[PDB]
Design a protein around this ligand. Structure first.
Ligand SMILES: */O=C1/[N]C([N])=N(*)C2=C1N=[C]N2[C]1O[C]([C]OP([O])(=O)OP([O])([O])=O)[C]([O])[C@@]1(*)[O]
Lengths: 50, 80, 208, 353
């Protein structure tokens, strides 16, 4: 793997909707806590009890 | 990076350099000094070798592919 | 489970099916059988119809096996058979002419003679009477004697040993000692016979 | 009744009429031509019979018809004897080495390339062979047995280049190579310097007609296969990081004349290879496919009945099949069934039966 792959991955990141510059998996924690919902707001959690 | 190339193009390929050094060493062995690699390309043996390495590197390895490889290198190396 | 009543036992003898047309008792038996041609038990994965197989070696295999490694028991039985064959042939290479003609090279009949050496003949039972346990001599059934000999060879191969020597050489040297009437399983057999001699006045305590 | 042992030890006299022949080799001859490398499960056969009796395998003879007429003008010519596992790939190289010592060639025998890769525990670096890690112990395995392969032609070599040995010693000029290979076998710190300087000196004198050099290397899939030996911070290396074997890879590049190198692909310790891969490109890899230096692939096949019937009928004069009903005809067809006319799986049965 070299920059041929790095540039293909970067342009498919600008294409398909991922982040183009590389980052840590600890910083991908924020994109997976932002690509879904918080725990409290789900219709089967705060409305567990009617 | 040629890792992303899929087919075996004979242009500046490594086994091409091996059979090319083989043609230079063989034409020195015969002491007949007609050293033109572009004339050495014109033989039937090296292009049967070229089709055999192309077929062997793209199509995965079967017995009859090795029969074709053996036939090419056998008429190539002056072996009976 | 999951077998049922009337299900029959396996048959292996091919030549028995080749020419059964000579008698009348078993002839009418297999007339009665094929007239029914019942739901038989399926043939197990341990036995075959071949002529290169032996029942006693497969039993000593299965009595040698720990758990579910039929492959390791197969490797041990194969290695010990070949090693004892090559020890007898290496003694053949260091033999004279009559020593060529008197040393046996088949490991199979040597092994079966070794088991017949290994076989206990008079047994024990703990019987309680007058509050004490008394060791009584009892004659044994045949399957008991042969089972005891096979497990005796197994366990004295296993644990009465050094941690240095590997198992197929170990079992080969054990069979070699058991083949010549001087192995330690024979000495244990002699102690068993000696103590069944020693408690000879207890043989009226058996009720059968 | 198979024609087995009337043909004596003569690899220069194997015809196609001579088929299925258990040719007897004298055991002193194996002290000369094969103490270096042999399969480990084959040593049981010889010391039990005192008959080094190799049956005529038709590809084992067929490579010799390419060694009568391979000219010494032509360079180092590769040959591979591959096939299914157990067909005697490592045993089909054994048929040609006995010819080349009968024709007085230079036997660069390598026992097993897998042991050069795996299972070597103690590790040194280098300074004279350009700063790479190397095994002095595997050099110590090779340098002792190599001399007694060929002893007539190793001392006739003149070392025509002044090599530096230590800060106390060097090398003397025009010396017999029988000195130079074993001059530092005592000083094992640079006994791995005794391989790459020395075998490249045998490259130069191979060009003339006094010496006929042939690489005899077994299992070349490990020479271009990625190794398992690790470094101190748990980093694996390349096969191009071993200075013991890095100069060994210089040899299969046809850079000398006068001989015809033979190699045999093996399947004992093919690391990171599936067991069901048995072909050359499937085992050597991509680095074993570009640097091929065009080689002739010899597909070692399975038996015909002519090699099958020769086998058990040989074991009958030796009284080897000790079973009662084993020489019956159908008892041959089950060994023909369970061993599928493969040589190595038949000997496993004829080990114990
Ligand atoms: O003439 C013979 N040719 C070959 N190939 N093998 C052979 C011959 N006589 C006896 N043998 C037996 O072959 C077995 C060794 O096989 P091996 O070790 O080379 O298998 P691999 O996997 O490497 O190809 C052995 O029993 C030997 O006695």
């Amino acid at each position: 793997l070299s920059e041929y792959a790095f540039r293909m991955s970067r342009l498919s990141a600008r294409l398909f909707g991922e982040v183009t510059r590389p980052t840590n998996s600890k910083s991908m924690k924020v994109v997976k806590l932002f690509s879904e919902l918080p725990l409290a707001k789900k219709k089967e959690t705060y409305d567990w009890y009617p | 990076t040629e890792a992303d190339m899929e087919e075996y193009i004979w242009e500046n390929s490594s086994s091409e350099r091996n059979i090319l050094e083989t043609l230079l060493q063989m034409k020195a062995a015969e002491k007949n000094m007609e050293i033109n690699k572009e004339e050495l390309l014109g033989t039937k043996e090296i292009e049967e070798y070229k089709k055999s390495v192309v077929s062997l590197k793209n199509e995965e390895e079967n017995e009859n592919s090795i029969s074709q490889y053996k036939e090419s290198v056998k008429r190539l190396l002056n072996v009976t | 489970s999951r077998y049922s009543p009337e299900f029959k036992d396996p048959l292996i003898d091919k030549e028995y099916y080749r020419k059964p047309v000579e008698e009348l008792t078993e002839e009418e038996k297999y007339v009665r059988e094929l007239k029914k041609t019942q739901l038989i038990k399926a043939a197990p994965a341990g036995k075959t119809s071949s002529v290169f197989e032996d029942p006693v070696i497969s039993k000593f295999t299965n009595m040698m096996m720990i758990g579910g490694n039929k492959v390791l028991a197969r490797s041990l039985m194969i290695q010990t058979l070949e090693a004892v064959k090559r020890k007898q042939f290496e003694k053949y290479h260091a033999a004279s002419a009559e020593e060529q003609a008197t040393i046996e090279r088949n490991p199979y009949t040597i092994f079966h003679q070794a088991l017949k050496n290994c076989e206990p003949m008079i047994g024990l039972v703990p019987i309680l009477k007058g509050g004490r346990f008394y060791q009584v001599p009892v004659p044994l059934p045949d399957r008991r004697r042969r089972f005891l000999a096979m497990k005796w060879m197994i366990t004295e191969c296993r644990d009465k040993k050094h941690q240095r020597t590997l198992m197929p050489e170990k079992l080969s040297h054990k069979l070699l000692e058991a083949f010549h009437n001087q192995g330690p399983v024979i000495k244990r057999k002699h102690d068993l016979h000696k103590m069944a001699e020693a408690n000879r006045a207890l043989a009226h305590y058996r009720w059968w | 009744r198979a024609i087995s042992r009337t043909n004596e030890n003569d690899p220069a006299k194997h015809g196609d009429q001579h088929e299925g022949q258990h040719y007897n080799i004298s055991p002193q001859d194996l002290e000369t031509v094969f103490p270096h490398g042999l399969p480990p499960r084959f040593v049981m056969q010889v010391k039990t019979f005192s008959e080094a009796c190799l049956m005529v395998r038709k590809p084992a003879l067929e490579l010799l018809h390419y060694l009568k007429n391979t000219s010494f003008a032509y360079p180092a010519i590769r040959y591979l004897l591959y096939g299914e596992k157990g067909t005697g790939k490592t045993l089909s190289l054994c048929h040609v080495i006995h010819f080349c010592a009968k024709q007085d060639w230079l036997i660069l025998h390598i026992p097993d390339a897998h042991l050069w890769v795996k299972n070597c525990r103690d590790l040194l670096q280098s300074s004279y062979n350009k700063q790479r890690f190397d095994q002095p112990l595997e050099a110590s395995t090779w340098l002792k047995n190599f001399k007694t392969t060929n002893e007539r032609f190793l001392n006739q070599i003149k070392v025509q280049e002044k090599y530096v040995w230590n800060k106390r010693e060097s090398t003397e000029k025009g010396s017999p190579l029988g000195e130079v290979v074993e001059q530092g076998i005592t000083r094992v710190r640079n006994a791995t310097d005794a391989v790459g300087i020395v075998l490249k000196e045998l490259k130069r004198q191979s060009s003339l007609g006094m010496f006929h050099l042939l690489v005899a290397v077994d299992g070349i899939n490990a020479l271009w296969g990625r190794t398992t030996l690790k470094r101190e911070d748990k980093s694996p290396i390349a096969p191009e990081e071993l200075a013991l074997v890095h100069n060994l890879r210089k040899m299969m590049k046809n850079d000398w004349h006068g001989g015809a190198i033979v190699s045999a692909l093996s399947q004992t310790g093919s690391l990171f290879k599936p067991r069901k891969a048995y072909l050359p490109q499937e085992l050597l890899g991509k680095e074993g496919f570009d640097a091929l230096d065009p080689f002739i692939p010899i597909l070692v096949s399975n038996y015909n009945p002519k090699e099958f019937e020769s086998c058990i009928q040989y074991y009958l004069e030796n009284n080897w099949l000790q079973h009662e009903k084993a020489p019956t005809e159908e008892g041959k067809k089950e060994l023909l069934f369970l061993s599928n006319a493969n040589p190595s799986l038949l000997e496993r049965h004829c080990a114990y039966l």
